[PDB]
Amino acid sequence: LVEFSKLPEQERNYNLQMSLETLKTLLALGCHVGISDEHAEDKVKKMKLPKNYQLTSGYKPAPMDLSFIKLTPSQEAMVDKLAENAHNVWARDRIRQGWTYGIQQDVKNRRNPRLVPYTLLDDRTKKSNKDSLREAVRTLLGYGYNLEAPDQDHAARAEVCSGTGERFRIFRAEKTYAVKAGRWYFEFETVTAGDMRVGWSRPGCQPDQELGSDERAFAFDGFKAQRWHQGNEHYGRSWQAGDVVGCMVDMNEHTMMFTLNGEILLDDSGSELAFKDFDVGDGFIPVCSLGVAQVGRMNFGKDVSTLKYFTICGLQEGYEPFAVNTNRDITMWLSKRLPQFLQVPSNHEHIEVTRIDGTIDSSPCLKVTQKSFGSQNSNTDIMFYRLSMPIECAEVFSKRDDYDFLMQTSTYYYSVRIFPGQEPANVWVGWITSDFHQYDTGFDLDRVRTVTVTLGDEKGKVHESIKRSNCYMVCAGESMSPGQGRNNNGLEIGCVVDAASGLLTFIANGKELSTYYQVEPSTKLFPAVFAQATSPNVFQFELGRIKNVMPLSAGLFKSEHKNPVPQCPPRLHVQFLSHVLWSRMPNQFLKVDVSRISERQGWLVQCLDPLQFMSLHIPEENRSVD
Amino acid sequence: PCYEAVLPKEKLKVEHSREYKQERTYTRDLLGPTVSLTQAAFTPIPVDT
Amino acid sequence: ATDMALALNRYLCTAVLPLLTRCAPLFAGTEHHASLIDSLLHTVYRLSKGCSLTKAQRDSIEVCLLSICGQLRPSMMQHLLRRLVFDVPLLNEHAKMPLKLLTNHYERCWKYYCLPGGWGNFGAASEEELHLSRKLFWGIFDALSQKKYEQELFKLALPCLSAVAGALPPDYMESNYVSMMEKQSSMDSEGNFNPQPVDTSNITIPEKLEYFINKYAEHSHDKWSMDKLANGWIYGEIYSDSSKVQPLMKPYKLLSEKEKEIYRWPIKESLKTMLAWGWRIERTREGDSMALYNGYSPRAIDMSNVTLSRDLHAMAEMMAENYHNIWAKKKKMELESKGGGNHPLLVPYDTLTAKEKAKDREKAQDILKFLQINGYAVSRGFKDLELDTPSIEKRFAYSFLQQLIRYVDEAHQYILEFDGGSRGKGEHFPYEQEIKFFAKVVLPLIDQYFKNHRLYFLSAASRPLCSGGHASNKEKEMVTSLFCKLGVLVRHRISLFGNDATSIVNCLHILGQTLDARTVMKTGLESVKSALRAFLDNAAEDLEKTMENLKQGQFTKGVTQIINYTTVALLPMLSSLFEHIGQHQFGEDLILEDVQVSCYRILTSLYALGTSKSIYVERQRSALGECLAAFAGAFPVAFLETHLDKHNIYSIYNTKSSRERAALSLPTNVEDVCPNIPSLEKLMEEIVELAESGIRYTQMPHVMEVILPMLCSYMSRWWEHGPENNPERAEMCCTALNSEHMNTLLGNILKIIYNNLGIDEGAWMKRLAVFSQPIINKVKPQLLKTHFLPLMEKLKKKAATVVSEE
Numbered sequence A: 001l002v003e004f005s006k007l008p009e010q011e012r013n014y015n016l017q018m019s020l021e022t023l024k025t026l027l028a029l030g031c032h033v034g035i036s037d038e039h040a041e042d043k044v045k046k047m048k049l050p051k052n053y054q055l056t057s058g059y060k061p062a063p064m065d066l067s068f069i070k071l072t073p074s075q076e077a078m079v080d081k082l083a084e085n086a087h088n089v090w091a092r093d094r095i096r097q098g099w100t101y102g103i104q105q106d107v108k109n110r111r112n113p114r115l116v117p118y119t120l121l122d123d124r125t126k127k128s129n130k131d132s133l134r135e136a137v138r139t140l141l142g143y144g145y146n147l148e149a150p151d152q153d154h155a156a157r158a159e160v161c162s163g164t165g166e167r168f169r170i171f172r173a174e175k176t177y178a179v180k181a182g183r184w185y186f187e188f189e190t191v192t193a194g195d196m197r198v199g200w201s202r203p204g205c206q207p208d209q210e211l212g213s214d215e216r217a218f219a220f221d222g223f224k225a226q227r228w229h230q231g232n233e234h235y236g237r238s239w240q241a242g243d244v245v246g247c248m249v250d251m252n253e254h255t256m257m258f259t260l261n262g263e264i265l266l267d268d269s270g271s272e273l274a275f276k277d278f279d280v281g282d283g284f285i286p287v288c289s290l291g292v293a294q295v296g297r298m299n300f301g302k303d304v305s306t307l308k309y310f311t312i313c314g315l316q317e318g319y320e321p322f323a324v325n326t327n328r329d330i331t332m333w334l335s336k337r338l339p340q341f342l343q344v345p346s347n348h349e350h351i352e353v354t355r356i357d358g359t360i361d362s363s364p365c366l367k368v369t370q371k372s373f374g375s376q377n378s379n380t381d382i383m384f385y386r387l388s389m390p391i392e393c394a395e396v397f398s399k400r401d402d403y404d405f406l407m408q409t410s411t412y413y414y415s416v417r418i419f420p421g422q423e424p425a426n427v428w429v430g431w432i433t434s435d436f437h438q439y440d441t442g443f444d445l446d447r448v449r450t451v452t453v454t455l456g457d458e459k460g461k462v463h464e465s466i467k468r469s470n471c472y473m474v475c476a477g478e479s480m481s482p483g484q485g486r487n488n489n490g491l492e493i494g495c496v497v498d499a500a501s502g503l504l505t506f507i508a509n510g511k512e513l514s515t516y517y518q519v520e521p522s523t524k525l526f527p528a529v530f531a532q533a534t535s536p537n538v539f540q541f542e543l544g545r546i547k548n549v550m551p552l553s554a555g556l557f558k559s560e561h562k563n564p565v566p567q568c569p570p571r572l573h574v575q576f577l578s579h580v581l582w583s584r585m586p587n588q589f590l591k592v593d594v595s596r597i598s599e600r601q602g603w604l605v606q607c608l609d610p611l612q613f614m615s616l617h618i619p620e621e622n623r624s625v626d
Numbered sequence B: 001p002c003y004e005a006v007l008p009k010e011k012l013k014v015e016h017s018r019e020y021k022q023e024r025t026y027t028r029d030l031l032g033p034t035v036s037l038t039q040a041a042f043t044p045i046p047v048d049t
Numbered sequence C: 001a002t003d004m005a006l007a008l009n010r011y012l013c014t015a016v017l018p019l020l021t022r023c024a025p026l027f028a029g030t031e032h033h034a035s036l037i038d039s040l041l042h043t044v045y046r047l048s049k050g051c052s053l054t055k056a057q058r059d060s061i062e063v064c065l066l067s068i069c070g071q072l073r074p075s076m077m078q079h080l081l082r083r084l085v086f087d088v089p090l091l092n093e094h095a096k097m098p099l100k101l102l103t104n105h106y107e108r109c110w111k112y113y114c115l116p117g118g119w120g121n122f123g124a125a126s127e128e129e130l131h132l133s134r135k136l137f138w139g140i141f142d143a144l145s146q147k148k149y150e151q152e153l154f155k156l157a158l159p160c161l162s163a164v165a166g167a168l169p170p171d172y173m174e175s176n177y178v179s180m181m182e183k184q185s186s187m188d189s190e191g192n193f194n195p196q197p198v199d200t201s202n203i204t205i206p207e208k209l210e211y212f213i214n215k216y217a218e219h220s221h222d223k224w225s226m227d228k229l230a231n232g233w234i235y236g237e238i239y240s241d242s243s244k245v246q247p248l249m250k251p252y253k254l255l256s257e258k259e260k261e262i263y264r265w266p267i268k269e270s271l272k273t274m275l276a277w278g279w280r281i282e283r284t285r286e287g288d289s290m291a292l293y294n295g296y297s298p299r300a301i302d303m304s305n306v307t308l309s310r311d312l313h314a315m316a317e318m319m320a321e322n323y324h325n326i327w328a329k330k331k332k333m334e335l336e337s338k339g340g341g342n343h344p345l346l347v348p349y350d351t352l353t354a355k356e357k358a359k360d361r362e363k364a365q366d367i368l369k370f371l372q373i374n375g376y377a378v379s380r381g382f383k384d385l386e387l388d389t390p391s392i393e394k395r396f397a398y399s400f401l402q403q404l405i406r407y408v409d410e411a412h413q414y415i416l417e418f419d420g421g422s423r424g425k426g427e428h429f430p431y432e433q434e435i436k437f438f439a440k441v442v443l444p445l446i447d448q449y450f451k452n453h454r455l456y457f458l459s460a461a462s463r464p465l466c467s468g469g470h471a472s473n474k475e476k477e478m479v480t481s482l483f484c485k486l487g488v489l490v491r492h493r494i495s496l497f498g499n500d501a502t503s504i505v506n507c508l509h510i511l512g513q514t515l516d517a518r519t520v521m522k523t524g525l526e527s528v529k530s531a532l533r534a535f536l537d538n539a540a541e542d543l544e545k546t547m548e549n550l551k552q553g554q555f556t557k558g559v560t561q562i563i564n565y566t567t568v569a570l571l572p573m574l575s576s577l578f579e580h581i582g583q584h585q586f587g588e589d590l591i592l593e594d595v596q597v598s599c600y601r602i603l604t605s606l607y608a609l610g611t612s613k614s615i616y617v618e619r620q621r622s623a624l625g626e627c628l629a630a631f632a633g634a635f636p637v638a639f640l641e642t643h644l645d646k647h648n649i650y651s652i653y654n655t656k657s658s659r660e661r662a663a664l665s666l667p668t669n670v671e672d673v674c675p676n677i678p679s680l681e682k683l684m685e686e687i688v689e690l691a692e693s694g695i696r697y698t699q700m701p702h703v704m705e706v707i708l709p710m711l712c713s714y715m716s717r718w719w720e721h722g723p724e725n726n727p728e729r730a731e732m733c734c735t736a737l738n739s740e741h742m743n744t745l746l747g748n749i750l751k752i753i754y755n756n757l758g759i760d761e762g763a764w765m766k767r768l769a770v771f772s773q774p775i776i777n778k779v780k781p782q783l784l785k786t787h788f789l790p791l792m793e794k795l796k797k798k799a800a801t802v803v804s805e806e
């Protein structure tokens, strides 16, 4: 309420420019601006306001006639969008100045509650700024300039934002509960409404394949009113939130039925049979699949009184609840979220592993190639391979080659030959521990999990610093610091591990690389190669030895601890990171009581009932299972 | 203090780190994958003008 | 005419082609033999085009081609579709099998084109097949429009155009980026194959690529030296062919510059060809740059394992085709110099199968692989200057409807001129081919296109066709304009069209079912809005003319013309349109103010005609029944319950006010707007009096032919606005309609049909049961049990007797 003279010229310049970038944003989001006539601007009359609206200083409040200007919904959405953009501009400015979000405002620590995304912004402030912006843009719209807001373009985001390796999770009964004969019934309550499937699955059903994409599953998909055994066909109708799907299987007549809240679902024809001709095939088990942000519940009818629509449909027809005559809860198996290393199947679609015996002039080798390369539907993604047995470092660290030195040494070697025509930049060579479970489509050496434990004295001076990770590997491309064609001779990275000192070193082509690692005592290192296949032949593990270094077999096998001759016993095979595995949900969990005691005492977490499980440990893989 | 990180609309709770806990089997919520927390980090990116 | 040619044709058409026809199902999953299948298809088609073949030979070729193409995957026939795109629009005698083939292919694989995903395993179109299909459609359409009418050719052309239109996505943006430097060598006006290599004269290789040229020359020389040592050629201190000694295994450095050109020349030509197409070749600096900074033994880079992306693979395919074109032009020149002859390989690269293509493919893939391994990157130089996607002018349906509207307007002028000059000397009016093209192509094309793409035009911000669709507001406006133009064209011309009148009324039916009244009235051209308003007004005027003509009759021309026009066209069009409006709840959107008063006149005329006790309307009472039921379901004001219509926000009396109500011809009284239509209470009194008086159907049939379907449709529409459905804001409800009304009417219906089960059977019972099907569902199921008691009683006891009923 001051003329521009005494008014803070910085504030007035902020006003003028923020309006200038305001019209710039108007044109940037795609709005078309057109003046019908400068005289059209002139004809509409400016109000001169009485003393109530009139300020004190004299900067006369002059609003133009805004009564007759109404905006189309696209223009109103434009107003909302540019208000969001202004909020983003202000937040970014304050962040650059150094302000951060806090649940209350603190000027001393430069903390504001308003530094949140516009969707979370509080309604009062957001609508106040929005209506000020609306009046500002309406002024120009009534100033003879029509502002054609660009037509809104709908975008389908598929509501998928999960982990890179998981798009759905599959829950099923245990394989041992497969029903070969009889009439069986279970229920599936849909807490949400979306990407969900429910039905019956054979024991061999895979956890990373969509239900009904292959023959192993017979499922109903109520998101799109479809049925899935081998592909999809239209069937039934769509559920809503809170609906109940009753699944019936009759092995005697080899039929399947689905009911939605009691009513029997029927296909395009009048048939009530979702699936009508299938073999018994090792029985069927209840199964469901849930997508991103989907919640379900599966009731096997252990307590028949808890079934919502069994009496309405299923009871009089002779179908039994799946858990009708059981004394304990059905064990539930669900798709494992953490990938694990396992042997390459002999029937794998893409990966082939060939074991080559060592000759007099050649060391034993394990060649990794591609079955599906040079053809269609060939996956071009990074595969993580390892050897099935680890090298264990010394438990306490001390502070023609010679036979005596070779006997007394604790240094072991292997090699990886990247074949000609395979891109070295797509191949990583080195060691991993049993903790490595990071399946990423894009793997780089800078994102390996790592930490540093720094131990100091009472004063605070660091007396030791330990670097710990699960990935100690180098890239063949960077190791090949000079770039060439690589087909003159296949590239050969040599990995050397000194277990007596826990020292990991690498050799490029007879030249020692600058990259080295220091590991803790008792560390178990699995030889590992990460490769993105650009060739039918990918790489080759080589179990030979170099001067003054024992072969890998000597370190791996106690019975071969003193044998310098390289060996590849059948126990040593090539494993790869895969997601085709199931997890067993525990039948019983720890009982934890959590409660807010008071504003001063905090949050009490209490657990008093002992619970134990019996763990079976695999010595090879340094892992344990229930 | 760690309570200052609560988002303005949410309320602070102490809960299980994992999805599944001790419940009745037929009342247990089976959960699919969850969306990534995009609102967790607020990076204001304006339209370039 | 040579004996060998005739005997070979006989052998093929008698033994080989029938064998392939019988083994056609084996051609299903052969996706890994695309070159062989393309060779077979192109050879068979180029054989089908010929002059030394008999009718049986042509028939055998047609059967073989159709059988194989019906089993091949849609992606395997792209090149054949290209030949078809060039050859079909001529519409010669040789085009009939091509049209049949295209019809079958597009009918089978419409999902491969139309759906955004397409067939799951087969995939979707590559946008090049979409451009080819659109080009084929428009070429055939223009050629057929120009062509003089021929029966078989038109009967084969209409299915092809319809199938291509149905296969193309309605919202297919025409990619203004045409195929850049597309080769014309395969496609020629004269002959089948004319090799036209890409010009390389003025292209100059940049000095940046000289190092790559030298390196690839060294590689080629080293690989050659490997091959020479392999077959045993000993190093040439001096040449000696007998002892197998070659001086050229010396190193490239010791090779002379005059000699080096033998290796550098193909490399230079390949690079010039790549640059001529506009491709950019640019260095990835670090690798090749440091390759710059830092007794013959043949050792060459082994590029067998190195792979190429799909884009660079297509690059290599184009380069191999160019190599084949260069060789083919050279060999054609040599053969012409010799004066005759024909090499078996003087065929298009598409017609060549894998073994012949292997060498050129190896050359192109080799040069591209060396570019990659040295570090140089190849890519399309051209980038689309502007996307131009949101502009709906490029949309295929936009232009299709523009052309359809233009043809309809022209036909309107044509029949207007013929009506003006029918009795003149020109009994054959000049525009015979044009009017016959219209009648025999345009109307069925509209019919089938709007059968196929109904949901796309109806699609809005609402759910239907959520995957991909949502026709534009202008597109819906053109749909409405087309419907109005077809209606005004068919008005009073059933006599002129005759057999065609069925086609026009079917087109109007389906266009009306595809109309989007809400969006058109909200955002649409004032001319189109006025056209729809005038169409409804014209329907009202014609119905009123029929009503007065019925009274003026009793003596039986204009009378017969208007009566037959009504019965044939007006009742079906109005029935379908009002049914669509009622189903989509459009009445609130369009039936307001003048449209509402026109609908009031329509309703009064319909009731008068239905209730009239005339032998002339006796035959047509039923169609009036469906029309009046549809109007009752569509009309947004409770006309029967006239005592409380002040609550209706959509009523003329509550909106348009007294001054304008008096300016229009309105009674100013809601009880007097429809004097001859009884109230709901009076109608139910009549209905309860019947079925107890025991009336027969023929005694007075207008009730259960016309009035009862009206009551069922009116109940169905106005029950969800009822006060039992609105305990909230009660007595502000526009209707006093109740479920008790619903079940009372249904029970009276049952009693009527039960009294009439013995005699006067007809089919009106099934008609009326169909009308009562919607009134059944809304009845409460608990009373519906023990309400089916009469239903099961009289479905068997009086239905199953000597007399056949229902």
Ligand SMILES: Nc1ncnc2c1ncn2[C@@H]1O[C@H](COP(=O)(O)OP(=O)(O)OP(=O)(O)O)[C@@H](O)[C@H]1O
Binding pocket: A011, A090, A094, A099, A112, A114
């Ligand atoms: N409603 C308003 N519209 C425009 N400018 C305003 C408004 N209210 C205050 N201002 C101006 O903005 C400045 C201070 O308000 P503003 O919200 O921009 O503060 P800030 O420093 O960005 O906020 P914070 O400390 O929360 O980060 C002053 O120059 C003031 O004149």
